[PDB]
Amino acid sequence: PQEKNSLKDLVYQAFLRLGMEKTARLLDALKYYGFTFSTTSGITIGIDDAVIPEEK
Amino acid sequence: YRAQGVKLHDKHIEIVVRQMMKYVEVTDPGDSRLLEGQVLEKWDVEALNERLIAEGKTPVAWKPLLMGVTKSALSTKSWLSAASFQNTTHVLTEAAIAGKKDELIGLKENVILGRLIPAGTGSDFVRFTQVVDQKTLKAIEEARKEA
Amino acid sequence: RVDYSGRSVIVVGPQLKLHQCGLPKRMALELFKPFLLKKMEEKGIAPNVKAARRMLERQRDIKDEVWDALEEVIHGKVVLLNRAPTLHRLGIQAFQPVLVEGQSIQLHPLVCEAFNADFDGDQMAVHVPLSSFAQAEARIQMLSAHNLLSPASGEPLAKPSRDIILGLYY
Amino acid sequence: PVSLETYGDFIPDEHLPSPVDAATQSLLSEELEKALSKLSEREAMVLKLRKGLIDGREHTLEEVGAFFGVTRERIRQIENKALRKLKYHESRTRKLRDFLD
Amino acid sequence: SDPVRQYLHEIGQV
Amino acid sequence: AEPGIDKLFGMVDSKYRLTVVVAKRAQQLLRHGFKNTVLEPEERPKMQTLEGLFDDPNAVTWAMKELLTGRLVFGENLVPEDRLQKEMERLYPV
Amino acid sequence: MEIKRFGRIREVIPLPPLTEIQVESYRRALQADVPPEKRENVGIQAAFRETFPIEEGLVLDFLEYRLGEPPFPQDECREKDLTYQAPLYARLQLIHKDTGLIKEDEVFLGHIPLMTEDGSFIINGADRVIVSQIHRSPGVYFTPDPARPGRYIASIIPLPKRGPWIDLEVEPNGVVSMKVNKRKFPLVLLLRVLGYDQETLARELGAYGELVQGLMDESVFAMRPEEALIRLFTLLRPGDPPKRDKAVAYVYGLIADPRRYDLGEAGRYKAEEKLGIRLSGRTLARFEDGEFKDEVFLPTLRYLFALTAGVPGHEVDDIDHLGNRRIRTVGELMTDQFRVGLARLARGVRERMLMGSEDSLTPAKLVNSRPLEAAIREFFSRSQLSQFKDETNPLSSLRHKRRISALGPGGLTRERAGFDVRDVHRTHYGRICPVETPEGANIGLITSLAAYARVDELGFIRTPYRRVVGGVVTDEVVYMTATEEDRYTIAQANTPLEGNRIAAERVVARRKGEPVIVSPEEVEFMDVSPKQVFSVNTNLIPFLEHDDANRALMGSNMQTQAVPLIRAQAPVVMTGLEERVVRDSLAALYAEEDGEVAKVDGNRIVVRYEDGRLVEYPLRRFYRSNQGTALDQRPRVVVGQRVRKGDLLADGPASENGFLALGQNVLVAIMPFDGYNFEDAIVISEELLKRDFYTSIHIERYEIEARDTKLGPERITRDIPHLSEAALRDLDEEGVVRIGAEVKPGDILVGRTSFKGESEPTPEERLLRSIFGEKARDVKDTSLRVPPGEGGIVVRTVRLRRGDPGVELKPGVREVVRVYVAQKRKLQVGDKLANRHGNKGVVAKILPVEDMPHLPDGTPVDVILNPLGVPSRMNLGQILETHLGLAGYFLGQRYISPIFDGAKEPEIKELLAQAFEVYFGKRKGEGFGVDKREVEVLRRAEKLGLVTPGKTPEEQLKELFLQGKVVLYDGRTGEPIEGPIVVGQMFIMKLYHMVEDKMHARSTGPYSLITQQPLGGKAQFGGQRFGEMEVWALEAYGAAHTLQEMLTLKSDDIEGRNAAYEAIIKGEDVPEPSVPESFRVLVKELQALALDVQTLDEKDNPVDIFEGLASK
Amino acid sequence: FNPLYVMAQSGARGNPQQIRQLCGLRGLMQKPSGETFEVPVRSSFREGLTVLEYFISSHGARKGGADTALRTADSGYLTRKLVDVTHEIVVREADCGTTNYISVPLFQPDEVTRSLRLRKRADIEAGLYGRVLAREVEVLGVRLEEGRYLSMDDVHLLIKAAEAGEIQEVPVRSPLTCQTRYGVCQKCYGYDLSMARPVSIGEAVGIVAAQSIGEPGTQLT
Amino acid sequence: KEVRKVRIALASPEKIRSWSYGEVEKPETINYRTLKPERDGLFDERIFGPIKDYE
DNA sequence: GCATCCGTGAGTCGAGGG
DNA sequence: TATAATGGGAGCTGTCACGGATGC
RNA sequence: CCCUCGA
Ligand SMILES: [Mg+2]
Ligand SMILES: [Zn+2]
């Protein structure tokens, strides 16, 4: 799964391999699709989302 | 910095430390005009020692001197930089007494005078570069070719 | 303190490209005012400069063609955006301005972390490089999309943030 | 009087000309020369001497008339006809109207 | 240190 | 990003030399009214007005694109300064 | 709508009058209601008793004082920019000792500011607040020596500027040293001066081994008290002649003179309690029968030796303990500056007694009131504890009046205040709120008084507790100091109670702040309420126990920045304080007695009381506050309505039916939205502007003066040269803009002409003049115009003319004109919103209603908050508020959830089920079944573990609804959000930080006099400051020409900036920059220091940057 | 796919400790004296604290706030000091031509003093990445030549060789050894960390160093 | 010429008098009714230059 | 060679008010 | 322009680190 | 400059 570190390494490797112009284009693409998919994802915070484990 | 998860390159710290080691104290004056205990720059004493060795004279014995960042800042050659940093009164009295000249080597000095800094596009390395199109270049070439 | 400068509240600019920032119309009109006068004289909007300045003085005297003239003025040019405090050099960055309605400056998301800028009410200052030399320095050296890695570490500085990460991970 | 150190950061300088004012005076001198070029050299020079755009001061009709070697009535008539041609050209092109504030 | 104390002493000399 | 910025940084031994070249060339283009341009009429940078496409007024855009065409010569001590000025005034009146 | 309240804790006592810390303090200080013979020796009476009598006519003595009526009412003082004050008369009598002649008269000493009914002051027309100070209480303290372990420092501290701090130390050589005014000398000498003998000191202090021997010096006991006194005077005053009466006077003034040295009444009390002695006066010693008599020193040294030896019953002191820190309220500070001005008046009185006719002298001839007036004026204008009142909303003023500062005159200096002063002490419990405090440099230095806390007569903060005898909780409540509190075991307010008896065998309590589990038999006292732990603002945060203290701080603070809205509403989730906050702020209007309402108007409400009398209450309408927010009272009753005592007659600003209304209740969906709520940004529905939610009224004041000059008078006139009728359209006959006109930037508010300065016309001006044949007019246009970015409707004009009744202005000014402009502000992009839980954000996007996420029934949400703010900020109160707000949205009700006592999760779940029945059974009766998108969402939530598999769609939807989540459809698509989303009602406020005030830009403008650099400030049309760090930034980019532009062409290169502007308007490139002017200023200011600064070339030959103009 | 879990794992928001305060127990707290209280808050923010728990936590919250406030000013003072020492340092030439260098170690002594063990990857990167080799290095059949700018792959290969025991320390050109006057040369400085390539002559390296050291000054706890 | 250096040194009384365009003999600033510089004062136009351009 | 007093420092921008 | 008149009066405190001279 | 308030 893509997360902070893997996306950071993607940006660095894209810089090294394809130049800062293409890396800026990739940054904007990741921005667009990330925002879009975060919207429809269903991410929210309800009080029941802080799950007290019984183990406690 | 590592403890707080801050990734920072060694070479910056090395720049700073290099400036902290910038000075030396004379252990023996040799054949020079220097005095025992006189503090000066390592570069200056090395140039003086190469001049005395090239003259067949006795070189100056010196000792490395580690001073903190503030003291190394205040002890710099530029009196403009030091006076604008702090202890302005002390800097200015000693500089006026010594009749000191600021060569405008660093950034602060040229910033005060409002000049173009000696860095980046202001670097003498890149700032004298010329640009010409091939038409004008060939016309100037013919002008040189006729004479 | 300095001329050809302004400031305002910042607002997230998700639609912006990395090299762009949203500049309010009135701010841009004031910051670029001499260029706008000269362009108004180049076209038929005013006979001379003084008439154009007296025309821009009162807000009710401002018509629609002056905004198109201002758009022509700012074409290809960049402004400097700066957020206080300025801890490293990325506290100032260069952006092609996009004229927007409203009074807020629009900031691209990926540069926020560099500026340490969020949207709980931060404000930013705008500066206009004047000479061809200043604008060339800003566009080549100080452009946002030309500074993608940290000069302190070398790791990517403009990179996906929490909102972007949340979607791609999902 | 009161102290500037209780303050002076709010106190502007009304003495030196603003860049807008200096640019306005520059364009004014340039446009006056543009309109004076539409006259002959003698009548333009008479206007400049009589309004003081040469040595800084205004010469009388006797001084300008003895400069060009002519009667004071003649030099006053030259000034009048130059002013008249200027008024005609200005009514035509409407270039110098904006500078009148 | 204090100029008026010093002048008062000098005055108290005579 | 500026178009082809990576190739431009490849051209020079220091990025600041690129900046100086671009700014000087843009000043040349401003001074001589873009009559010295090495760009063919189809290579001219354009701007979309309300009416239609016109020339790009930005001389630095022009300068960078010209630089990319390989048709500009840059370096130090290419020609005396006043000689360059006078020859450019000769070929392209101001 | 129905208000359901939760909580099982019944508060025994209500909140005390929240402004009493101001009102009662100043009332005690003035004693204006007390007949003079009954006045106590406290207050300004005390200052009179200290100053007078004045001796060496020979004697001028004080009889009594009186305060007269104010010359002008409060509103009129605000109007004419006067001070609300009362004249102070003092009856004095001059007595000649020899003659016996007695001439008595009442002399006028000037005025004194009167405190308003709400606890503020009116100074020069501006409302101001005197903030209480916190400081180390006077007394005798003992602290550990940081350098020497096992050794201790004794410290005798009087009131501020009431005498020096004295230190007693045991030196390494054994002798006990005293330090006053930074002078170390053996204490034995002073002990001899006090009249002590080696016998008495040996019998008193001998019980401590090896210590009293450092006190034994034979050379000191070899001289009588007079010789030792002159010795001490030679030690303390080098060079000063050691005369006998001079030494007696000096030492008496240093120790025994009450007119000079004064421990507090609190200082005396603490000294008596610590040292176990009794003080006759408030000094350290006395002058009795020609000799000095000891009060404090010997018990202090005894306690010091005892603490050093380790003998029991002697302990070190916590100087941050709230038993050793007291509060100087407004009355005490005003009385201090009053004493100062009175002492200056006394110096003037003696000076006037030396000079002039000795036989003929009256009190009026001796007293010059001016220095006292000046002292009081300096206090109420330029003191650090005298602050511009915050009237943004009523809670702003209330909190401002309840503030406590550690800075100020005699207080701490910043950056010398470490962690200890800013820490919250265990004794802060119940007294000083632990959350309400500023972020940044002022943290822990500015604090707030707790809700139930009170300041006693000695100045200590006391908190209430309930008596518990044998496990029975009484209704007897006792207010304690921290010193008293540390003596008891005090149970928590949530302790289970059946009737008045403790029902738990294990009880949570505190012993000296330490938490401990304890039997009911052990419980001495019990807390009154959780409310007593926090301030007023912190008590307004529901679900506070679910919020991390930092975001709690943020919401608590930001509540005072809430703008009063035209349609402002009280929160649907309240804490129960919202009514008392309105009542105690004097925001709204209430019925004085029972009666019937006779008349109702947007202006006045006339009420007939049970007495038959007819009282008419006028309503403050659209008044401009200190921060420009609108203050207007709206009538809330109708004609003929029967009202009882305390019922609401009219609603004040930011008040809804007597409930505090700082914002709007909006429908909220917690979800990201295409990056527009990225990093705390907020997205709002355009509907909010359609129904005028978050719309506020703001009034701005503009002011102009016409004055007499040497070149002729300024005058306000409609005749303005070179201006059309279009520009003069809305000006009336006199040159003042008409009421009701709309003004835009550049419009003239007041026309004014001023005679031109003496003008030598440049030759271009003369030629152009002769060309257009027009005489240059004598005057020029100085009219007051609307600044950039401002404007609105003119609601008021005030004109004050010289030569007119009741109007006398400053010397030289002919008249003053004030124009009031009101504007209606809709919520716009860049404005600041916040909730009570610390969630703050700027409005980044306003969506059309069709773009908003919406409920299946077609109801769109109002604002979209990004959930990413919640986890790291750890403030869950907003979540629970949202859940309960959804419930109250569909049940049509509001809730009162007291802090730590509020609604629990199961009760919110019950209410949410009741709401789900309304939200869904309505649909199922309307003839509609489950939607397909709802089924898809239910499958996703079934995968998410939110609903139980196998249940019907209605059961799973109810399961989600009980978790607070609903199905949401994207307005642009119609496709649902893949997951269920938390949606509910939330209380959000519009903060005072609005982009309309903050947007500014400048091309060129005014420059400073000496620096020739752009001015600062938006009002002056200033430029942004490019500081040291921005220069560092440009240097690090290596952008030399941009930097040089910042340093020359845009700031202080006159030639450069003029050439740049001209080149740009010509269409050319900007020219090479010149030398910045402030560097020439540096060269010249260095020359005035006798320092030659030379700019040289590479050949070391001078270069002149002044271009020859400075050389002869 | 719990929201808190997703956000914490992805790196969008949150860390295990804030999540623990939300779901688990709030934890232990400090007295004003830095001393720790014996009994911790057993409650979460989900469950709600008692007024005594809340008041106890207020100590640490206020202490941290005052810490941050008093910290910003000292960090800024330090940054300005650094800017003042280093500001004259610029890249003024390509190579000063010194034979001197430093040796970055890949191993550090164990605290047990038992043996030497491999340094942490991030630290090796911070000391090696973007530098220039002062000597030839032959490891794992790879030639890293003198004068070579070490890329990140070069650093990782050097780490592999260290793990294989082929190299214990790396010779490298450094500003400490640069003989350039008034500044630093291109080879001794190495990469421009922003562009992942050799540094351009004229780069104001001292200001960059001062800002790099200063900026995370307010994070130092 | 171009400035390449900046020097600072002590100023001799003769150097100070060489700078000076006149001695200020009076502690006067401006006349109370005319608001113009007093003769031989701190603001004297005879010493420090004219108040108005070329007048 | 070791204590003690004296001078100098102690983040930025922005707003508002007096 | 003349009785004689002859040594002032505000004080004010909860920081810390460094250099430097000053005093056992 | 002081206070307060933003970042
Ligand atoms: Mg922020
Ligand atoms: Zn080198």
mmCIF file of N, CA, C and O in Angstrom, chain G residues 32-76:
data_model
loop_
_atom_site.group_PDB
_atom_site.id
_atom_site.type_symbol
_atom_site.label_atom_id
_atom_site.label_comp_id
_atom_site.label_asym_id
_atom_site.label_seq_id
_atom_site.Cartn_x
_atom_site.Cartn_y
_atom_site.Cartn_z
ATOM 1 N N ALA G 32 -17.303 56.138 48.302
ATOM 2 C CA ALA G 32 -18.097 57.316 47.974
ATOM 3 C C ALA G 32 -19.466 57.283 48.640
ATOM 4 O O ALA G 32 -20.059 58.341 48.876
ATOM 5 N N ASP G 33 -19.988 56.089 48.933
ATOM 6 C CA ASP G 33 -21.273 55.970 49.610
ATOM 7 C C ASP G 33 -21.153 56.112 51.120
ATOM 8 O O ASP G 33 -22.158 56.385 51.787
ATOM 9 N N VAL G 34 -19.960 55.949 51.670
ATOM 10 C CA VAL G 34 -19.781 55.979 53.122
ATOM 11 C C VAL G 34 -19.722 57.432 53.584
ATOM 12 O O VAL G 34 -18.930 58.216 53.035
ATOM 13 N N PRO G 35 -20.537 57.830 54.558
ATOM 14 C CA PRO G 35 -20.363 59.143 55.185
ATOM 15 C C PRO G 35 -18.965 59.278 55.761
ATOM 16 O O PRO G 35 -18.450 58.335 56.377
ATOM 17 N N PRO G 36 -18.325 60.436 55.577
ATOM 18 C CA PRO G 36 -16.881 60.546 55.861
ATOM 19 C C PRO G 36 -16.449 60.092 57.249
ATOM 20 O O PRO G 36 -15.357 59.528 57.386
ATOM 21 N N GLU G 37 -17.264 60.320 58.282
ATOM 22 C CA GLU G 37 -16.864 59.923 59.629
ATOM 23 C C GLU G 37 -16.813 58.408 59.803
ATOM 24 O O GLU G 37 -16.128 57.925 60.710
ATOM 25 N N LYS G 38 -17.512 57.655 58.954
ATOM 26 C CA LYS G 38 -17.553 56.201 59.032
ATOM 27 C C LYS G 38 -16.549 55.521 58.107
ATOM 28 O O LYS G 38 -16.514 54.289 58.057
ATOM 29 N N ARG G 39 -15.740 56.286 57.379
ATOM 30 C CA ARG G 39 -14.831 55.695 56.407
ATOM 31 C C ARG G 39 -13.699 54.965 57.115
ATOM 32 O O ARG G 39 -13.214 55.404 58.161
ATOM 33 N N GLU G 40 -13.282 53.837 56.543
ATOM 34 C CA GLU G 40 -12.164 53.086 57.092
ATOM 35 C C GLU G 40 -10.835 53.690 56.634
ATOM 36 O O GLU G 40 -10.776 54.515 55.717
ATOM 37 N N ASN G 41 -9.758 53.269 57.293
ATOM 38 C CA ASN G 41 -8.412 53.723 56.965
ATOM 39 C C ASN G 41 -7.836 53.031 55.733
ATOM 40 O O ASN G 41 -6.630 53.122 55.501
ATOM 41 N N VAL G 42 -8.656 52.321 54.966
ATOM 42 C CA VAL G 42 -8.234 51.761 53.693
ATOM 43 C C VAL G 42 -8.590 52.728 52.565
ATOM 44 O O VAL G 42 -9.375 53.666 52.734
ATOM 45 N N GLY G 43 -7.995 52.508 51.400
ATOM 46 C CA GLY G 43 -8.401 53.233 50.210
ATOM 47 C C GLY G 43 -7.668 54.547 50.022
ATOM 48 O O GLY G 43 -6.550 54.745 50.499
ATOM 49 N N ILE G 44 -8.315 55.459 49.290
ATOM 50 C CA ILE G 44 -7.732 56.785 49.105
ATOM 51 C C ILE G 44 -7.749 57.551 50.418
ATOM 52 O O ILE G 44 -6.930 58.458 50.633
ATOM 53 N N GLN G 45 -8.672 57.200 51.317
ATOM 54 C CA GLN G 45 -8.591 57.678 52.690
ATOM 55 C C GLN G 45 -7.229 57.353 53.295
ATOM 56 O O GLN G 45 -6.630 58.187 53.985
ATOM 57 N N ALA G 46 -6.708 56.154 53.018
ATOM 58 C CA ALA G 46 -5.390 55.777 53.524
ATOM 59 C C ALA G 46 -4.296 56.665 52.948
ATOM 60 O O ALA G 46 -3.362 57.048 53.658
ATOM 61 N N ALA G 47 -4.376 56.978 51.654
ATOM 62 C CA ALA G 47 -3.375 57.854 51.056
ATOM 63 C C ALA G 47 -3.409 59.232 51.699
ATOM 64 O O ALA G 47 -2.358 59.826 51.972
ATOM 65 N N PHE G 48 -4.610 59.755 51.954
ATOM 66 C CA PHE G 48 -4.708 61.023 52.670
ATOM 67 C C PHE G 48 -4.090 60.919 54.061
ATOM 68 O O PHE G 48 -3.354 61.816 54.490
ATOM 69 N N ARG G 49 -4.358 59.821 54.773
ATOM 70 C CA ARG G 49 -3.834 59.672 56.128
ATOM 71 C C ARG G 49 -2.319 59.512 56.135
ATOM 72 O O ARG G 49 -1.665 59.850 57.128
ATOM 73 N N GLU G 50 -1.749 58.989 55.050
ATOM 74 C CA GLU G 50 -0.298 58.868 54.961
ATOM 75 C C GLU G 50 0.353 60.196 54.602
ATOM 76 O O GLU G 50 1.372 60.573 55.195
ATOM 77 N N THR G 51 -0.219 60.914 53.632
ATOM 78 C CA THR G 51 0.379 62.168 53.184
ATOM 79 C C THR G 51 0.355 63.216 54.291
ATOM 80 O O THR G 51 1.390 63.805 54.625
ATOM 81 N N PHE G 52 -0.834 63.458 54.882
ATOM 82 C CA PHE G 52 -1.089 64.454 55.912
ATOM 83 C C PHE G 52 -0.887 63.862 57.305
ATOM 84 O O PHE G 52 -1.113 62.665 57.516
ATOM 85 N N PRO G 53 -0.466 64.677 58.292
ATOM 86 C CA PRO G 53 -0.228 66.127 58.217
ATOM 87 C C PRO G 53 1.076 66.522 57.518
ATOM 88 O O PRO G 53 1.987 65.704 57.387
ATOM 89 N N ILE G 54 1.148 67.772 57.073
ATOM 90 C CA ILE G 54 2.323 68.322 56.404
ATOM 91 C C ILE G 54 2.855 69.461 57.265
ATOM 92 O O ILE G 54 2.163 70.467 57.469
ATOM 93 N N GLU G 55 4.081 69.307 57.762
ATOM 94 C CA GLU G 55 4.653 70.224 58.740
ATOM 95 C C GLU G 55 5.855 70.962 58.155
ATOM 96 O O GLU G 55 6.279 70.716 57.022
ATOM 97 N N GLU G 56 6.401 71.877 58.956
ATOM 98 C CA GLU G 56 7.553 72.700 58.578
ATOM 99 C C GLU G 56 7.306 73.485 57.293
ATOM 100 O O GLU G 56 8.086 74.367 56.933
ATOM 101 N N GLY G 57 2.459 79.120 56.780
ATOM 102 C CA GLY G 57 2.099 78.421 58.000
ATOM 103 C C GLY G 57 2.918 77.167 58.249
ATOM 104 O O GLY G 57 3.631 76.695 57.364
ATOM 105 N N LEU G 58 2.807 76.620 59.459
ATOM 106 C CA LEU G 58 3.644 75.491 59.840
ATOM 107 C C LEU G 58 2.994 74.139 59.558
ATOM 108 O O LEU G 58 3.687 73.205 59.137
ATOM 109 N N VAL G 59 1.683 74.005 59.769
ATOM 110 C CA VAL G 59 1.009 72.712 59.716
ATOM 111 C C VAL G 59 -0.226 72.810 58.828
ATOM 112 O O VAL G 59 -1.042 73.726 58.987
ATOM 113 N N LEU G 60 -0.360 71.860 57.900
ATOM 114 C CA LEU G 60 -1.540 71.695 57.057
ATOM 115 C C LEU G 60 -2.036 70.263 57.215
ATOM 116 O O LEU G 60 -1.318 69.316 56.879
ATOM 117 N N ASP G 61 -3.254 70.105 57.723
ATOM 118 C CA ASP G 61 -3.760 68.802 58.121
ATOM 119 C C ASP G 61 -5.005 68.435 57.319
ATOM 120 O O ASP G 61 -5.692 69.296 56.760
ATOM 121 N N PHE G 62 -5.286 67.137 57.269
ATOM 122 C CA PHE G 62 -6.392 66.587 56.495
ATOM 123 C C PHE G 62 -7.583 66.323 57.406
ATOM 124 O O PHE G 62 -7.445 65.653 58.434
ATOM 125 N N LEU G 63 -8.750 66.855 57.034
ATOM 126 C CA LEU G 63 -9.983 66.580 57.766
ATOM 127 C C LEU G 63 -10.777 65.435 57.146
ATOM 128 O O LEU G 63 -11.008 64.410 57.793
ATOM 129 N N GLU G 64 -11.190 65.594 55.893
ATOM 130 C CA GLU G 64 -12.030 64.622 55.206
ATOM 131 C C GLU G 64 -12.002 64.951 53.720
ATOM 132 O O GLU G 64 -11.415 65.951 53.296
ATOM 133 N N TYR G 65 -12.646 64.100 52.924
ATOM 134 C CA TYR G 65 -12.759 64.323 51.491
ATOM 135 C C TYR G 65 -14.185 64.019 51.057
ATOM 136 O O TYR G 65 -14.975 63.430 51.802
ATOM 137 N N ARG G 66 -14.511 64.431 49.835
ATOM 138 C CA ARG G 66 -15.801 64.117 49.245
ATOM 139 C C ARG G 66 -15.664 64.037 47.732
ATOM 140 O O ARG G 66 -14.772 64.647 47.131
ATOM 141 N N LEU G 67 -16.558 63.259 47.128
ATOM 142 C CA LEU G 67 -16.654 63.123 45.683
ATOM 143 C C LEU G 67 -18.009 63.646 45.231
ATOM 144 O O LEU G 67 -19.045 63.252 45.778
ATOM 145 N N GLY G 68 -17.999 64.545 44.249
ATOM 146 C CA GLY G 68 -19.221 65.098 43.708
ATOM 147 C C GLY G 68 -19.744 64.301 42.527
ATOM 148 O O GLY G 68 -19.178 63.291 42.115
ATOM 149 N N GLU G 69 -20.858 64.779 41.980
ATOM 150 C CA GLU G 69 -21.475 64.121 40.840
ATOM 151 C C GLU G 69 -20.599 64.276 39.596
ATOM 152 O O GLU G 69 -19.848 65.247 39.472
ATOM 153 N N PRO G 70 -20.669 63.327 38.665
ATOM 154 C CA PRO G 70 -19.913 63.458 37.417
ATOM 155 C C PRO G 70 -20.430 64.624 36.595
ATOM 156 O O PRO G 70 -21.649 64.827 36.490
ATOM 157 N N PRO G 71 -19.535 65.423 36.009
ATOM 158 C CA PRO G 71 -20.000 66.521 35.145
ATOM 159 C C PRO G 71 -20.775 66.051 33.922
ATOM 160 O O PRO G 71 -21.595 66.812 33.393
ATOM 161 N N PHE G 72 -20.553 64.825 33.458
ATOM 162 C CA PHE G 72 -21.208 64.346 32.252
ATOM 163 C C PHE G 72 -21.523 62.865 32.382
ATOM 164 O O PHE G 72 -20.778 62.123 33.034
ATOM 165 N N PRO G 73 -22.620 62.411 31.779
ATOM 166 C CA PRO G 73 -22.956 60.984 31.812
ATOM 167 C C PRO G 73 -22.041 60.173 30.907
ATOM 168 O O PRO G 73 -21.280 60.705 30.092
ATOM 169 N N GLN G 74 -22.144 58.848 31.056
ATOM 170 C CA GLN G 74 -21.195 57.940 30.415
ATOM 171 C C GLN G 74 -21.264 58.035 28.894
ATOM 172 O O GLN G 74 -20.233 58.169 28.221
ATOM 173 N N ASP G 75 -22.473 57.943 28.330
ATOM 174 C CA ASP G 75 -22.607 58.014 26.879
ATOM 175 C C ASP G 75 -22.085 59.341 26.346
ATOM 176 O O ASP G 75 -21.405 59.383 25.315
ATOM 177 N N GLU G 76 -22.371 60.436 27.052
ATOM 178 C CA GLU G 76 -21.885 61.734 26.606
ATOM 179 C C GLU G 76 -20.368 61.824 26.698
ATOM 180 O O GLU G 76 -19.736 62.482 25.863
#
